Ligand code: HEM
């Protein structure tokens with residue numbers, strides 16, 4: 367038998383711990399012999415699991431197009447995913463408009479706002495001694511940051527989460543499309559308001575931008591709105607939820623981050639390696655051979671980053687969280703021309719989130735009377751992480 371034959375990122379076997387990591391480890395073992403395999407799922411597609419094979423695919427933009435970045439395709443109506451769903455020269459043209467606001471220098475400026483936000487959020491339940499770390503904290507830190515980036519009201523997270531759920535998980539196609547159409551309606555309204563009253567946020571920036579002397583179409587602006595929403599509300603939230611779950615039970619990891627705060631940045635990169643939630647697809651546009659496998663135009667290759675990030679030929683002791691690991695050339699944020707636009711921002715965000723969480727609540731554990739839940743998909747991670755902790759005090763009454 368082979369684990370590739372029915373591999374499906376939306377239907378990964380979960381182990382007794384509640385994660386797909388036993389399955390991922392078994393697939394990684396198989397990938398040492400067969401780094402690329404055919405899956406019968408989604409009508410047939412290639413699963414790319416080896417580190418060097420993923421790198422070969424991701425670097426070869428001539429044969430592998432980002433038109434297949436989401437597979438099955440996200441529900442975004444007739445709109446394509448801005449930057450992520452495009453090839454050069456179109457892709458580069460748009461990324462250039464937002465490179466600066468996402469640079470390390472610029473994103474470092476969010477640090478104190480995030481620190482304050484994390485503490486204000488913790489205040490909401492610290493006196494209760496219990497809460498769902500995903501719903502209460504991991505979801506809300508990036509939701510509020512995303513609202514700030516987009517110039518939206520930070521308190522409307524539930525609305526934003528409902529849009530993103532429709533894009534990424536709603537089964538019924540008509541329901542999904544209708545809810546994405548609600549996002550579009552809200553985006554158009556936002557865009558019109560900012561045309562006359564622009565702020566300092568990223569939507570205002572692109573709305574006032576030009577390419578070769580021309581303003582962006584409303585459709586292109588809706589694309590920008592949608593991709594930034596996804597990175598925050600889906601990718602970041604699921605990553606942080608998985609991290610908080612791990613910290614809840616792994617008392618050895620936890621004590622080391624508290625004793626050595628200087629290691630938190632390196633530990634965040636190791637946690638990205640280990641709990642990085644994303645996979646991406648590529649559409650094959652010309653016949654190409656990778657390793658032993660020849661792929662044909664029209665086929666899709668899924669890049670199983672979590673498996674490659676556990677490849678023994680790329681990482682010593684890959685199944686262990688080695689917080690002092692360096693270098694750490696993991697693929698959780700991609701590589702090459704499409705490498706995560708939000709990479710520096712989310713590294714800052716994670717550092718702060720972990721730091722303040724462990725400062726405020728050094729002692730906690732998983733709730734024995736409530737269930738954790740892992741969400742499978744193209745972005746996969748914990749969705750519910752009930753924890754308990756000694757009742758504490760608010761910083762701000
Ligand atoms: C832990 C959180 C996140 C993870 C793990 C993640 C992961 C990734 C990955 C793997 C890619 C590569 C896409 C590919 O190769 O096709 C990517 C691209 C991208 N991400 Fe992130 N992402 C995260 C958060 C964010 C955030 C917060 C934002 C924006 C505020 C964002 C915006 C983007 C954009 C625009 C691209 C496309 C870049 C391009 O095509 O040049 N992401 N992300």
Ligand SMILES: CC1(C)O[C@]2(C)CC[C@H]1CC2
Pocket residue numbers: 435436450593596597601644645646744745
């Ligand atoms: C999964 C991944 C990497 O996240 C977004 C934000 C970028 C590319 C794809 C789809 C949406």
